[PDB]
Scaffold this active site. Structure first.
Site, mmCIF file in Angstrom:
data_model
loop_
_atom_site.group_PDB
_atom_site.id
_atom_site.type_symbol
_atom_site.label_atom_id
_atom_site.label_comp_id
_atom_site.label_asym_id
_atom_site.label_seq_id
_atom_site.Cartn_x
_atom_site.Cartn_y
_atom_site.Cartn_z
ATOM 1 N N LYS A 28 -15.023 -4.972 -11.645
ATOM 2 C CA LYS A 28 -14.142 -5.683 -12.553
ATOM 3 C C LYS A 28 -13.824 -7.029 -11.955
ATOM 4 N N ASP A 29 -13.661 -7.068 -10.633
ATOM 5 C CA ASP A 29 -13.359 -8.302 -9.933
ATOM 6 C C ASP A 29 -14.552 -9.239 -9.912
ATOM 7 N N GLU A 46 0.298 -33.763 -6.431
ATOM 8 C CA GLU A 46 -0.711 -32.837 -6.929
ATOM 9 C C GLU A 46 -0.166 -32.102 -8.144
ATOM 10 N N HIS A 93 0.826 -1.188 0.000
ATOM 11 C CA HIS A 93 0.000 0.000 0.000
ATOM 12 C C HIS A 93 0.863 1.242 0.000
ATOM 13 N N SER A 118 -0.502 -0.442 -6.489
ATOM 14 C CA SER A 118 -0.338 -1.490 -7.469
ATOM 15 C C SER A 118 0.573 -0.979 -8.574
HETATM 16 C C1 HEM Z 1 -3.044 -15.946 -0.573
HETATM 17 C C2 HEM Z 1 -2.386 -15.566 -1.651
HETATM 18 C C3 HEM Z 1 -2.399 -14.186 -2.153
HETATM 19 C C4 HEM Z 1 -3.398 -13.271 -2.152
HETATM 20 C C5 HEM Z 1 -4.783 -13.508 -1.584
HETATM 21 C C6 HEM Z 1 -2.850 -12.092 -2.790
HETATM 22 C C7 HEM Z 1 -3.616 -10.937 -3.012
HETATM 23 C C8 HEM Z 1 -3.154 -9.854 -3.699
HETATM 24 C C9 HEM Z 1 -3.886 -8.723 -3.998
HETATM 25 C C10 HEM Z 1 -5.339 -8.525 -3.721
HETATM 26 C C11 HEM Z 1 -3.065 -7.852 -4.598
HETATM 27 C C12 HEM Z 1 -3.410 -6.497 -5.138
HETATM 28 C C13 HEM Z 1 -4.235 -6.678 -6.430
HETATM 29 C C14 HEM Z 1 -3.493 -7.464 -7.486
HETATM 30 O O1 HEM Z 1 -2.464 -6.960 -7.952
HETATM 31 O O2 HEM Z 1 -3.888 -8.582 -7.937
HETATM 32 C C15 HEM Z 1 -1.820 -8.445 -4.695
HETATM 33 C C16 HEM Z 1 -0.730 -7.803 -5.215
HETATM 34 C C17 HEM Z 1 0.498 -8.415 -5.184
HETATM 35 N N1 HEM Z 1 0.775 -9.665 -4.800
HETATM 36 FE FE1 HEM Z 1 -0.382 -10.941 -4.112
HETATM 37 N N2 HEM Z 1 -1.595 -12.312 -3.170
HETATM 38 C C18 HEM Z 1 -1.266 -13.530 -2.814
HETATM 39 C C19 HEM Z 1 -0.114 -14.234 -3.038
HETATM 40 C C20 HEM Z 1 0.965 -13.600 -3.616
HETATM 41 C C21 HEM Z 1 2.173 -14.223 -3.916
HETATM 42 C C22 HEM Z 1 2.481 -15.683 -3.716
HETATM 43 C C23 HEM Z 1 2.972 -13.208 -4.407
HETATM 44 C C24 HEM Z 1 4.374 -13.226 -4.823
HETATM 45 C C25 HEM Z 1 5.104 -14.324 -4.900
HETATM 46 C C26 HEM Z 1 2.255 -12.024 -4.412
HETATM 47 C C27 HEM Z 1 2.860 -10.875 -4.757
HETATM 48 C C28 HEM Z 1 2.084 -9.778 -4.948
HETATM 49 C C29 HEM Z 1 2.717 -8.579 -5.454
HETATM 50 C C30 HEM Z 1 4.174 -8.370 -5.787
HETATM 51 C C31 HEM Z 1 1.719 -7.718 -5.596
HETATM 52 C C32 HEM Z 1 1.921 -6.336 -6.126
HETATM 53 C C33 HEM Z 1 1.653 -6.538 -7.584
HETATM 54 C C34 HEM Z 1 1.186 -5.309 -8.301
HETATM 55 O O3 HEM Z 1 0.047 -4.824 -8.087
HETATM 56 O O4 HEM Z 1 1.922 -4.878 -9.202
HETATM 57 N N3 HEM Z 1 1.062 -12.297 -3.909
HETATM 58 N N4 HEM Z 1 -1.886 -9.675 -4.116
HETATM 59 C C1 HEM Z 2 -5.395 -22.331 1.869
HETATM 60 C C2 HEM Z 2 -6.361 -22.838 2.591
HETATM 61 C C3 HEM Z 2 -6.501 -24.272 2.372
HETATM 62 C C4 HEM Z 2 -5.962 -25.076 1.393
HETATM 63 C C5 HEM Z 2 -5.065 -24.641 0.235
HETATM 64 C C6 HEM Z 2 -6.419 -26.377 1.732
HETATM 65 C C7 HEM Z 2 -6.119 -27.470 0.961
HETATM 66 C C8 HEM Z 2 -6.638 -28.701 1.270
HETATM 67 C C9 HEM Z 2 -6.444 -29.849 0.485
HETATM 68 C C10 HEM Z 2 -5.673 -29.964 -0.828
HETATM 69 C C11 HEM Z 2 -7.038 -30.874 1.110
HETATM 70 C C12 HEM Z 2 -7.037 -32.240 0.527
HETATM 71 C C13 HEM Z 2 -8.473 -32.293 0.060
HETATM 72 C C14 HEM Z 2 -8.806 -33.640 -0.482
HETATM 73 O O1 HEM Z 2 -8.181 -34.087 -1.496
HETATM 74 O O2 HEM Z 2 -9.733 -34.268 0.100
HETATM 75 C C15 HEM Z 2 -7.655 -30.378 2.258
HETATM 76 C C16 HEM Z 2 -8.298 -31.173 3.158
HETATM 77 C C17 HEM Z 2 -8.805 -30.627 4.321
HETATM 78 N N1 HEM Z 2 -8.822 -29.334 4.688
HETATM 79 FE FE1 HEM Z 2 -8.056 -27.920 3.764
HETATM 80 N N2 HEM Z 2 -7.162 -26.327 2.833
HETATM 81 C C18 HEM Z 2 -7.247 -25.093 3.272
HETATM 82 C C19 HEM Z 2 -7.837 -24.509 4.330
HETATM 83 C C20 HEM Z 2 -8.423 -25.300 5.279
HETATM 84 C C21 HEM Z 2 -8.923 -24.797 6.490
HETATM 85 C C22 HEM Z 2 -8.946 -23.390 6.994
HETATM 86 C C23 HEM Z 2 -9.459 -25.808 7.145
HETATM 87 C C24 HEM Z 2 -10.036 -25.567 8.452
HETATM 88 C C25 HEM Z 2 -9.962 -26.690 9.122
HETATM 89 C C26 HEM Z 2 -9.262 -26.997 6.346
HETATM 90 C C27 HEM Z 2 -9.691 -28.240 6.657
HETATM 91 C C28 HEM Z 2 -9.449 -29.305 5.840
HETATM 92 C C29 HEM Z 2 -9.881 -30.641 6.251
HETATM 93 C C30 HEM Z 2 -10.637 -30.981 7.518
HETATM 94 C C31 HEM Z 2 -9.472 -31.477 5.289
HETATM 95 C C32 HEM Z 2 -9.591 -32.957 5.208
HETATM 96 C C33 HEM Z 2 -10.936 -33.424 4.772
HETATM 97 C C34 HEM Z 2 -10.793 -33.547 3.267
HETATM 98 O O3 HEM Z 2 -9.880 -34.139 2.646
HETATM 99 O O4 HEM Z 2 -11.665 -32.989 2.611
HETATM 100 N N3 HEM Z 2 -8.631 -26.622 5.219
HETATM 101 N N4 HEM Z 2 -7.365 -29.053 2.349
HETATM 102 C C1 LIG Z 3 -12.883 -5.567 4.397
HETATM 103 C C2 LIG Z 3 -11.619 -4.799 4.730
HETATM 104 C C3 LIG Z 3 -10.453 -5.649 5.186
HETATM 105 C C4 LIG Z 3 -9.173 -5.490 4.386
HETATM 106 C C5 LIG Z 3 -8.635 -6.774 3.762
HETATM 107 C C6 LIG Z 3 -9.560 -7.585 2.846
HETATM 108 C C7 LIG Z 3 -9.104 -7.814 1.389
HETATM 109 C C8 LIG Z 3 -8.962 -6.510 0.645
HETATM 110 O O1 LIG Z 3 -8.239 -5.587 0.962
HETATM 111 O O2 LIG Z 3 -9.771 -6.535 -0.422
HETATM 112 C C9 LIG Z 3 -9.390 -5.797 -1.615
HETATM 113 C C10 LIG Z 3 -10.584 -5.810 -2.537
HETATM 114 C C11 LIG Z 3 -8.196 -6.503 -2.262
HETATM 115 N N1 LIG Z 3 -8.113 -6.145 -3.661
HETATM 116 C C12 LIG Z 3 -7.190 -5.279 -4.069
HETATM 117 O O3 LIG Z 3 -6.384 -4.734 -3.311
HETATM 118 C C13 LIG Z 3 -7.169 -4.973 -5.518
HETATM 119 C C14 LIG Z 3 -6.318 -3.940 -5.890
HETATM 120 C C15 LIG Z 3 -6.180 -3.531 -7.196
HETATM 121 C C16 LIG Z 3 -6.875 -4.163 -8.198
HETATM 122 C C17 LIG Z 3 -7.724 -5.187 -7.841
HETATM 123 N N2 LIG Z 3 -8.441 -5.822 -8.844
HETATM 124 C C18 LIG Z 3 -8.190 -5.574 -10.112
HETATM 125 O O4 LIG Z 3 -9.048 -5.616 -10.962
HETATM 126 C C19 LIG Z 3 -7.887 -5.619 -6.517
HETATM 127 O O5 LIG Z 3 -8.718 -6.618 -6.231
HETATM 128 C C20 LIG Z 3 -8.271 -8.003 -2.088
HETATM 129 O O6 LIG Z 3 -8.953 -8.733 -2.730
HETATM 130 O O7 LIG Z 3 -7.411 -8.404 -1.153
HETATM 131 C C21 LIG Z 3 -7.811 -9.416 -0.196
HETATM 132 C C22 LIG Z 3 -6.727 -10.466 -0.289
HETATM 133 C C23 LIG Z 3 -7.868 -8.701 1.149
HETATM 134 O O8 LIG Z 3 -7.801 -9.714 2.193
HETATM 135 C C24 LIG Z 3 -6.727 -9.718 3.000
HETATM 136 O O9 LIG Z 3 -5.676 -9.213 2.706
HETATM 137 C C25 LIG Z 3 -7.002 -10.452 4.285
HETATM 138 C C26 LIG Z 3 -7.223 -11.948 4.072
HETATM 139 C C27 LIG Z 3 -8.688 -12.275 3.785
HETATM 140 C C28 LIG Z 3 -6.329 -12.474 2.963
#
Ligand code: HEM
Ligand code: HEM
Ligand SMILES: CCCCCC[C@H]1C(=O)O[C@H](C)[C@H](NC(=O)c2cccc(NC=O)c2O)C(=O)O[C@@H](C)[C@@H]1OC(=O)CC(C)C
Ligand SMILES: CCCCCCCCCCCCCCCCCC(=O)OC[C@H](COP(=O)([O-])OCC(O)COP(=O)([O-])OC[C@@H](COC(=O)CCCCCCCCCCCCCCCCC)OC(=O)CCCCCCCCCCCCCCCCC)OC(=O)CCCCCCCCCCCCCCCCC
Ligand SMILES: CCCCCCCCCCCCCCCCCC(=O)OC[C@H](COP(=O)([O-])OCC[N+](C)(C)C)OC(=O)CCCCCCCCCCCCCCCCC
Ligand SMILES: CCCCCCCCCCCCCCCCCCCC(=O)O[C@H](COC(=O)CCCCCCCCCCCCCC)COP(=O)(O)OCCN
Ligand SMILES: CCCCCCCCCCCCCC(=O)OC[C@H](COP(=O)([O-])O)OC(=O)CCCCCCCCCCCCC
Ligand SMILES: CCCCCCCCCCCCO[C@@H]1O[C@H](CO)[C@@H](O[C@H]2O[C@H](CO)[C@@H](O)[C@H](O)[C@H]2O)[C@H](O)[C@H]1O
Ligand SMILES: O=C1C(O)=C([C@H]2CC[C@@H](c3ccc(Cl)cc3)CC2)C(=O)c2ccccc21
Lengths: 85, 383, 124, 75, 54, 438
Positions: B228-229, B272, B202, B206
């Site tokens: 857009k999202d 996987e 922030h 972006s």
């Molecule tokens: C749980 C996984 C993730 C979530 C939910 C997440 C979410 C977001 C969001 C909402 C933004 C701003 C909007 C966008 O640019 O798409 C963002 C930007 C960014 N994310 Fe992620 N992200 C995740 C994982 C990652 C990973 C694995 C990377 C890098 C390895 C990454 C690097 C970035 C970077 C560098 C930005 C700035 C990009 C830019 O706007 O130019 N994020 N992410």
């Molecule tokens: C990033 C978030 C998560 C990812 C990427 C993830 C991924 C997975 C995956 C790949 C499996 C194997 C599913 C299958 O082949 O059956 C699984 C199983 C499971 N996950 Fe998650 N999980 C997530 C979050 C959570 C959370 C928050 C819970 C809260 C408990 C949860 C509970 C479970 C349970 C109970 C199972 C085993 C039952 C099953 O296989 O369906 N997971 N998860």
């Molecule tokens: C409710 C307030 C709590 C603040 C956090 C909640 C989320 C939040 O900030 O939402 C925003 C909508 C954010 N998007 C963006 O920045 C965004 C910016 C530029 C362009 C686009 N799209 C383009 O076309 C975007 O989508 C987003 O999706 O980020 C989530 C991951 C956030 O969750 C968290 O980090 C917390 C947890 C749930 C992961």
């Protein structure tokens, strides 16, 4: 490096007049046919080589490797497989 | 002054989801961030729901998953939604990291969100894996064995750490119960880190597809990017629906519907789809420690992109040579993915090694060289 | 990488007859394919500016050049989001692609690198 | 008469130069000892650490040579 | 006394190293001291005290 | 190569020290006294400054008005200042007006009237000076800094003294003060410029021969100070600029570390945004401060006394929300005197001092002040060659050793004046006097 509304951190702007119309006043899909056909063709053509070159090369590489692998595990490929192991 | 600005709590929400000034020209690849947010929300909802029905004890785990499929109302949906969204989470996260690498989102001033992101990527891998193990099917048990033995690579203490992580001499009940605990936990840690990388972003805002400053032309996050999202939310849900309802097992391994038998491992071991690239890397290297290091390094090496990209220009929109190099890098990462699931046989052993070298040479050789040359071509070419 | 680096290396190439003979045509083609001119940018508009040094260089631009830069970036942002290219007068012609910023950043960096050097001087 | 000041630029990198870094070499030494002492202290409980490190130390090492009598050991 | 300050306390690296080495010593000696003390206050009670009969 | 400083004594023990410059046409003669406010107790504190006013209030011969006229007719001027440890009374004149001026100085020092009527008149003038120093912020800060650093000790007293004393100073205790303290063995008659030494000694034999000698003649610059780490905050939100001084116990004139402390002071240096060159100074702190606009100025000082000193820095800043950074960065620069300094900084600072110590002496009054200061603090004039040798002896290792015993993790005296809301509490400032990373 970025500010907020009012102090975003743009170098001072002067002399740009921006005009737009209301979303209600505009046709959102005006010229959609033209864009969908001619604009998308333009954008696709311009990017095509950047996708085609690596995809075609790695598909060739995969194809050659998968064909060799298949052939090594035939009767004809017995000898070449024996050398590989 | 508007309540949304006055009130401290609302003001934080406001600053993220409403007034947040975004560049006006973000393209659809900026939508993965919100899809990953949606995946994370789906995973929490379905995950916590499965946790209400799942039993972590090894004697019951596999059966509790069958009970979920068969007896729990809508259990099939919740289970497949959870499993499939884990796949979509990885499509979206590779897309999101792809976007970031292509548009130079890792460069200053965004090295911090990038580097936090690399940790989110590692945590996702560990979360998704720990979740894979909870089914306690054949692949689950074997996956557990291998991941918990990657620490055996660590010399001396290694073997003891392995036993400590298993809580036994083998993967068994203890391991499965601790994987359940941590799989439940890890996603909340991951949501913290996801939030943190946004907070780090922030400061700079972006990036945009041109790689120029957007300070000249900003748009409020809502309504523009909110609406857009939604397009991608619905496009994602369409793809989600096709998998979840029509082909819930396309992305799965049959062997995980066999209960864990510690006496055999399936002849066809293939992890996987999303771990396949790093699995091929691990197979490529013929040394224990080597193989592990390379596999981890394949993720950690992303941390050096800020250094090794020597470009004076942010991102690849305007760099034909870099775009071609990026195309080959991406296709090589897909080739590694493919080689992860063939049999360990000629000629794919040598091929997998060549792809592994190419993967690393992108960060260590090619990117530094190409980015240097293109700097010079921009300057000479425009004189 | 620093603009200084890029500029000095470019000058080494333009000096060597052989090098220039083979590199200048490559670079001109590269720039044509780069296609930044099709969004009405000058090369220098694309230099990363989120850096102390560059912010300082951009503050040093004459008001005229600065206002025009803002306009070209606004206009290019608008082309980008519309997925259109520049047409007519908006396309940057090779003669208009002037390195308006390079002199300013080279001065900024010259001082910054002198400062680093002199911070490490040893009285003899 | 002096025509020019007499100096060189020492090689430097990321604002470190060899003069400065050399003054910190001792301190890294001590912090490495602190990390060594501290790490070894953390894993003093690990049986391998006793077996392979701590029991080998002269005089003091007998602190970590403890056998449970087989009369009191179910395992 | 200045000397002791200069060696063990002035540099934080040295002070932290000293604290961790002291913690090591304390940890080992405290364990041993409490073990002996615990055996003296609960003399004839514990398994080690009746074990000899078997 | 400067001309030789000649030195003679009288029988009573008055030192005469002279440095001729046949290139100038004026001459500064004066009397440097190794006595000042420090020589008072708590009851007569302010006496020394009081006397300075009364010195020009007329003598047994010339009245106040006659005195004025005599000096006007000489052509030059008389000037005096009382500091904590040193009182000076000099007379800048023309070359051939020196016999007049020595005669006038000898008169005002020996044969001052100190008439009850004049004591009573000045008692108002000096009382009004208490509420007009209020404006000289530098002096307000440094007066508080001494008051706090040397809490309830002689050096901690101000020069003006408390209001209470000014109201109760009698001609008796003034006379007693100058009889006890302005003794021949504590005074130096100094001539710089167009003076002949032998002529000046004759003038001293004529005018200063009937000066009292003290019962126990100690050498010049002979002294027990116990520095108090402490703070004074004089927060004044209405002031635009914050003035902060931070000081540690520094070095006496005769310390073995005196040159080491000056070198250290030069490494931190001075800065003033109003000077064009200051943004380009080599000093690390100067770079941090100028790039970040943290201060309007800073000025390192090393004030020395006979038996202690203060070494520190005086900052002024309008950046009231970043005073925390300003103090933080300053003290982190001092930490690096202990942890980081090498030949790079030390040799640079030595070069800047090798010139600086000689640059200071650019007019007859500065030369006289240097002769006088050195004679009253060290008992001799130190030649430039000896000063250059003492500086050359300062190594990087010496500076680190000095900083590690004097600065590192030491108590500071901190005075803040003005809008210093942003200055953190004493602990957080004092915590910056060490580095946890070292
Ligand atoms: C749980 C996984 C993730 C979530 C939910 C997440 C979410 C977001 C969001 C909402 C933004 C701003 C909007 C966008 O640019 O798409 C963002 C930007 C960014 N994310 Fe992620 N992200 C995740 C994982 C990652 C990973 C694995 C990377 C890098 C390895 C990454 C690097 C970035 C970077 C560098 C930005 C700035 C990009 C830019 O706007 O130019 N994020 N992410
Ligand atoms: C990033 C978030 C998560 C990812 C990427 C993830 C991924 C997975 C995956 C790949 C499996 C194997 C599913 C299958 O082949 O059956 C699984 C199983 C499971 N996950 Fe998650 N999980 C997530 C979050 C959570 C959370 C928050 C819970 C809260 C408990 C949860 C509970 C479970 C349970 C109970 C199972 C085993 C039952 C099953 O296989 O369906 N997971 N998860
Ligand atoms: C409710 C307030 C709590 C603040 C956090 C909640 C989320 C939040 O900030 O939402 C925003 C909508 C954010 N998007 C963006 O920045 C965004 C910016 C530029 C362009 C686009 N799209 C383009 O076309 C975007 O989508 C987003 O999706 O980020 C989530 C991951 C956030 O969750 C968290 O980090 C917390 C947890 C749930 C992961
Ligand atoms: C998964 C979950 C489902 C959710 C869906 C999200 C996917 C959306 C997305 O990010 O991609 C759509 C995205 C449309 O996004 P956009 O914002 O219109 O333009 C983004 C490009 O930067 C604009 O690129 P461009 O203007 O250069 O257009 C390029 C594109 C033409 O773009 C099109 O729209 C088609 O054509 C190609 O590159 C195709 C190569 C030729 C094949 C023979 O499609 C692409 O451009 C994909 C090209 C990738 C190769
Ligand atoms: C598969 C092969 C990839 C080649 C991509 C080359 C660029 C291209 O043509 O794409 C179209 C577009 C081109 O967009 P652009 O922004 O460069 O150009 C827009 C048009 N101009 C130049 C006029 C401004 O590129 C993208 O949008 C690329 C996003 C990358 C996503 C990669 C996902 C892979 C996952 C691996 C993770 C590790
Ligand atoms: C799955 C969720 C989909 C269902 C909710 C969508 C909105 C339903 C219709 C309502 C609508 O369009 O009206 C606007 C409500 O949208 C809004 O206020 C929100 C706009 C878009 C909804 C969600 C935003 C997504 C962006 C980030 C995605 C994050 C994914 C992580 C889970 C208000 O119209 P208006 O406010 O424009 O003004 C106009 C005058 N008042
Ligand atoms: C257990 C805990 C471990 C904590 C370890 C801390 C190590 C700190 C070392 C450090 O800060 O070195 C600084 C030194 C260069 O000095 P400078 O330019 O920062 O003055 O840096 C270099 O020399 C490189
Ligand atoms: C579930 C987790 C609970 C907390 C999560 C909620 C969202 C995350 C907020 C943490 C980040 C807050 O960190 C800070 O907050 C303030 C208060 O809005 C915001 O401040 C931002 O907007 C305000 C006004 O809208 C501007 O004055 C400011 O220039 C800008 O930086 C920024 O976002 C950030 O500088
Ligand atoms: O042999 C393997 C194997 O190697 C992995 C692999 C692939 C991805 C690895 C990984 C990739 C990246 C990171 Cl940052 C950490 C681990 C984890 C182990 C598995 O997931 C697997 C699952 C089931 C049976 C066997 C196996």
């Amino acid at each position: 490096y970025m500010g907020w509304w009012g102090h975003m951190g743009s170098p001072p702007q002067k002399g740009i007049a921006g005009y737009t119309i209301s979303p209600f006043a505009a046709r959102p899909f005006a010229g959609v046919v033209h864009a969908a056909i001619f604009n998308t063709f333009r954008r696709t053509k311009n990017q095509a080589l950047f996708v085609i070159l690596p995809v075609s090369f790695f598909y060739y590489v995969w194809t050659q490797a998968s064909e060799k692998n298949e052939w090594l595990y035939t009767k004809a490929g017995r000898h070449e497989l024996a050398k590989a192991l | 002054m508007a309540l949304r600005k006055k009130n401290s709590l609302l003001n934080m929400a406001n600053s993220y989801v409403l007034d947040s000034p975004q560049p006006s020209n973000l393209n659809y690849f900026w939508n993965f961030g919100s899809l990953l947010a949606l995946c994370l929300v789906i995973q929490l909802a379905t995950g916590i729901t499965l946790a209400m029905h799942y039993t972590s004890h090894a004697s019951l785990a596999f059966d509790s998953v069958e009970h979920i499929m068969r007896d729990v109302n809508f259990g099939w949906f919740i289970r497949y939604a959870h499993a499939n969204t884990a796949s979509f989470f990885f499509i979206c996260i590779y897309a999101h990291m792809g976007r970031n690498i292509y548009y130079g989102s890792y460069k200053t001033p965004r090295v911090l969100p990038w580097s936090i992101g690399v940790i989110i990527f590692l945590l996702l891998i560990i979360t998704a894996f720990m979740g894979y193990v909870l089914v306690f099917g054949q692949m689950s048990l074997w996956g557990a064995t291998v991941i918990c033995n990657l620490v055996s690579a660590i010399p001396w203490l290694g073997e003891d750490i392995v036993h400590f992580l298993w809580g036994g001499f083998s993967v068994g009940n203890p391991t499965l119960q601790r994987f359940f605990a941590l799989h439940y936990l890890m996603p909340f840690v991951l949501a913290v880190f996801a939030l943190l990388h946004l907070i780090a972003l922030h400061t700079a805002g972006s990036s945009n597809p041109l790689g120029i400053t957007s300070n000249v032309d900003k748009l409020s996050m809502h309504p523009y990017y909110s609406f857009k999202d939604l397009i991608t939310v619905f496009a994602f849900l369409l793809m989600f629906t096709l998998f979840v309802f029509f082909s819930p097992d396309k992305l799965g391994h049959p062997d995980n519907y066999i209960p864990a038998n510690p006496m055999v491992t399936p002849a066809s071991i293939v992890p996987e789809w999303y771990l396949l690239p790093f699995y091929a890397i691990l197979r490529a290297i013929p040394d224990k420690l080597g193989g592990v290091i390379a596999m981890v390094a394949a993720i950690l090496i992303l941390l050096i992109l800020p250094i090794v990209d020597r470009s004076i220009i942010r991102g690849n929109a305007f760099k034909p040579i870099s775009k071609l190099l990026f195309g080959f890098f991406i296709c090589n990462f897909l080739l590694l993915g493919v080689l992860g699931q063939v049999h360990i046989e000629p000629p794919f052993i040598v091929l997998g090694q060549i792809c592994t070298i190419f993967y690393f040479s992108y960060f260590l050789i090619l990117l530094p060289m190409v980015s240097t040359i293109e700097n010079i071509f921009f300057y000479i070419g425009s004189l | 990488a620093s603009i200084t680096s890029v500029v000095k290396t470019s000058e080494l190439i333009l000096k060597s007859p052989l090098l220039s003979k083979i590199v200048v045509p490559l670079a001109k083609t590269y720039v044509k394919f780069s296609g930044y001119r099709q969004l009405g940018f000058k090369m220098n508009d694309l230099i990363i500016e989120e850096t102390p040094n560059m912010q300082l260089a951009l503050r040093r631009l004459p008001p005229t050049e600065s206002y025009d830069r803002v306009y070209r970036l606004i206009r290019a942002t608008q082309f980008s989001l519309s997925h259109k290219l520049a047409t007519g007068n908006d396309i940057t012609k090779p003669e208009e692609d002037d390195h308006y910023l390079i002199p300013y950043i080279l001065d900024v960096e010259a001082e910054a690198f002198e400062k680093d050097a002199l911070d490490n001087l040893e009285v003899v | 008469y002096v025509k020019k000041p007499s100096y060189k630029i020492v090689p430097h990198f990321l604002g470190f130069n060899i003069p400065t870094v050399s003054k910190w070499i001792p301190i890294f030494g001590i912090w490495g000892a602190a990390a060594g002492i501290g790490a070894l202290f953390l894993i003093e409980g690990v049986p391998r650490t006793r077996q392979d490190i701590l029991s080998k130390i002269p005089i003091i090492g007998e602190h970590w040579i403890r056998e449970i009598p087989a009369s009191d050991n179910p395992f | 006394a200045t000397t002791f300050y200069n060696v063990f306390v002035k540099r934080n690296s040295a002070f932290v190293a000293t604290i961790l080495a002291s913690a090591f010593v304390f940890d080992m000696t405290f364990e041993t001291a409490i073990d002996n003390f615990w055996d003296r206050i609960n003399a004839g009670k514990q398994w080690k005290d009746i074990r000899h009969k078997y | 190569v400067s001309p030789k400083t000649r030195t003679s004594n009288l029988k009573n023990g008055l030192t005469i020290a002279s440095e001729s410059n046949p290139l100038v046409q004026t001459a500064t003669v004066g009397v440097w006294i190794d006595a000042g406010s420090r020589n008072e107790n708590a009851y007569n504190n302010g006496t020394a400054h009081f006397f300075e006013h009364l010195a020009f209030k007329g003598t047994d011969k010339r009245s106040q008005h006659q005195l004025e006229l005599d000096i006007e007719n000489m052509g030059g001027h008389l000037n005096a200042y009382t500091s904590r440890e040193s009182t000076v009374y000099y007379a800048k004149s023309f070359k051939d007006d020196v016999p007049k001026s020595v005669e006038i100085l000898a008169d005002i020092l020996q044969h001052s009237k100190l008439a009850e009527s004049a004591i009573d008149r000045e008692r108002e003038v000096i009382t009004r000076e208490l509420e007009e120093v209020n404006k000289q912020y530098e002096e307000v800060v440094f007066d508080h800094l001494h008051a706090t650093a040397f809490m309830n000790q002689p050096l901690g007293r101000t020069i003006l003294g408390p209001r209470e004393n000014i109201q109760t100073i009698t001609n008796t205790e003034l006379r007693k003060f100058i009889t006890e303290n302005y003794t021949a063995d504590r005074m130096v008659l100094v001539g710089a410029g167009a003076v002949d030494h032998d002529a000046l000694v004759e003038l001293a034999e004529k005018y200063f021969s009937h000066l009292p000698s003290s019962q126990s003649p100690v050498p010049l610059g002979t002294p027990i100070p116990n520095f108090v780490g402490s703070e004074v905050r004089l927060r004044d939100d209405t002031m635009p600029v914050a003035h902060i001084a931070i000081a540690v116990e520094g070095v006496s004139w005769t310390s073995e570390d005196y040159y080491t402390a000056l070198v250290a002071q030069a490494i931190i240096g001075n800065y003033d945004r109003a000077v064009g060159t200051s943004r380009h100074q080599g000093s690390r702190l100067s770079n941090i401060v100028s790039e970040n606009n943290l201060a309007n100025s800073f000025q390192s000082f090393s004030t020395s006394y006979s038996d202690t000193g203060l070494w520190g820095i005086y900052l002024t800043s309008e950046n009231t929300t970043q005073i925390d950074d300003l103090v933080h960065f300053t003290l982190k620069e001092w930490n690096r005197l202990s942890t980081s300094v090498s030949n790079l900084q030390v040799e640079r600072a030595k070069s800047q001092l090798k010139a600086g110590l000689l640059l200071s002496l650019d007019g007859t009054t500065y030369v006289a002040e240097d002769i006088g200061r050195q004679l009253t603090t060290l008992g001799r004039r130190v030649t430039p060659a000896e000063v250059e040798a003492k500086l050359e002896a300062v190594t990087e290792h010496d500076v680190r050793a000095w900083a590690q015993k004097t600065l590192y993790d030491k108590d500071i005296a901190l005075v803040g004046l003005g809008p210093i809301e942003g200055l953190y509490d004493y602990n957080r400032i004092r915590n910056d006097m060490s580095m946890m990373r070292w």
